[PDB]
Design a protein around this nucleic acid. Structure first.
Ligand code: CTP
Ligand code: CA
Length: 425
DNA sequence: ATGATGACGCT
DNA sequence: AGCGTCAT
């Protein structure tokens, strides 16, 4: 009772850019703004593969991974922007650079963990503490939270009026006098996230959504509840009702085989149903670490820290060669390894200038035709010089003998070069 | 014939 | 070391 930890020790946000690649292309090309549009990679095969979709185009059913020719069937007026292609492969440099624009703004407010090209977690616990002292005991005005939803409220007209009704019920109940109230801490966290999101939009033109809660899993779930261009506060108290109809696969790390096995072995559907099992029962089905994690998570409790990490730990370059394009001669394999190695050298050289580090290991991964796995084979070698001809030759040497005989058999459907094991320089 | 990319766990 | 899982 008095010794039951409630997982309310931190304020954590997750910031997620809305249709990110689309916003990057729309900033650059005003003719694309406020239109059904998508970002595509390649072009010759069925018009290219869709990677990102504006909310106007999503209303027609356009989705990621769809071929652009097929998307045009659902949305004949769909506008398209193409990803840059360099040395025969898609070149995402424009979007990584726009990502850095955003991450550098967020880093002004708190330590961030880069979660992907367009997501970062924020540990706001200290910023909230400082802000709670500056705001003496003053109440929090609804005007400081103009894009915030309070999940679960209102309880007991149009979209915006309902948002404000919920926000009013939340603020009216807040114990402003208690500087240790977790609900007050989340609310201040949301005020800071409003400021952070305003700064991102002012300084880059980009809109985003955010979740604010007590841990990373709840912040990530919260972020998706009201997209786009809104933020959502998930309090500890909101968790039982929210989890009572929340499919297990929606929780971060439960979207794959482990989540499917929770459903199958326990015969449940929703995250809240996990509360009925003991920690030992969950550890027996899913392992010590997974069971302890599940036991706490279904109660809204998670301790995974926001890691102080803005830079990737690996830098990689990959390309698929599907169907009849599979690489089937030694010259082909060697030419494409050179193309990937040239793009990788370019990124590594910029990384060494920008971030004062050198990679020391080169990982080479290939996929062989007829293998459903992401990678058929991984080998490593020393990365001593940032020279593309050397890296591609080393990569070849390391995979040479996977060839079961001028010809390459079986043909390669993927090539992957990854620079890893960075050291300060 | 979705991709390109990246983190981390298990052994 | 090398493979498997899960994610944007
Ligand atoms: N299966 C996926 C999902 C995402 N991504 C990468 O992650 C980026 C951002 O993904 P995501 O946040 O899922 O999509 P958005 O386009 O930003 O849409 P949303 O508004 O839903 O966040 C994409 O551009 C893409 O580069 C990817 O490569 N493969
Ligand atoms: Ca996004």
């Amino acid at each position: 009772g008095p010794h039951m930890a409630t997982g309310q020790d931190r304020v954590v946000a997750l910031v997620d850019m809305d249709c990110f690649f689309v916003q990057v292309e729309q900033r650059q090309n005003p003719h694309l703004r406020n239109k059904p549009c998508a970002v595509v990679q390649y072009k010759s095969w069925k018009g290219g593969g869709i990677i990102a979709v504006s909310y106007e185009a999503r209303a027609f059913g356009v989705t990621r991974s769809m071929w652009a020719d097929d998307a045009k069937k659902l949305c004949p007026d769909l506008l398209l922007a193409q990803v840059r292609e360099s040395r025969g492969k898609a070149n995402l440099t424009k979007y990584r650079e726009a990502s850095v624009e955003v991450m550098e703004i967020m880093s002004r407010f708190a330590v961030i963990e880069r979660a992907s090209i367009d997501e970062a977690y924020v540990d706001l616990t200290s910023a909230v503490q400082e802000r709670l002292q500056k705001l003496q005991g003053q109440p929090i005005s609804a005007d400081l939270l103009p894009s915030t939803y309070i999940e679960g409220l209102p309880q007991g007209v149009q979209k915006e009026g309902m948002r404000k009704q919920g926000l009013f019920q939340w603020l009216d109940s807040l114990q402003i006098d208690n500087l240790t109230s977790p609900d007050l801490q989340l609310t201040v966290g949301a005020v800071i996230v409003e400021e952070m999101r305003a700064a991102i939009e002012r300084e880059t033109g980009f809109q985003c959504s955010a979740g604010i809660s007590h841990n990373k899993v709840l912040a990530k779930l919260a972020c998706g509840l009201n997209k786009p261009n809104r933020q959502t506060l998930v309090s500890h108290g909101s968790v039982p009702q929210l989890f009572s109809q929340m499919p297990i696969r929606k929780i971060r790390s439960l979207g794959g085989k482990l989540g499917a096995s929770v459903i199958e072995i326990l015969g449940i559907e929703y995250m809240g149903e996990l509360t009925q099992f003991t920690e030992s029962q969950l550890q027996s089905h899913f392992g010590e670490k997974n069971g302890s994690w599940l036991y706490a998570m279904c109660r809204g409790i998670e301790h995974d820290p926001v890691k102080p990490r803005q830079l990737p730990k690996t830098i990689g370059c990959s390309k698929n060669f599907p169907g009849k394009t599979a690489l089937a001669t030694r010259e082909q394999v060697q030419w494409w390894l050179l193309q990937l190695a040239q793009e990788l050298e370019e990124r590594l050289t910029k990384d060494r200038n920008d971030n004062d580090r050198v990679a020391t290991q080169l990982v080479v991964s290939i996929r062989v035709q007829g293998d459903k796995r992401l990678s058929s084979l991984r080998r490593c070698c020393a990365l001593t010089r940032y020279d593309a001809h050397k890296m591609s030759h080393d990569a070849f040497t390391v995979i040479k003998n996977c060839n079961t005989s001028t010809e390459w058999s079986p043909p390669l459907t993927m090539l992957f070069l990854c620079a890893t094991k960075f050291s300060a320089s």
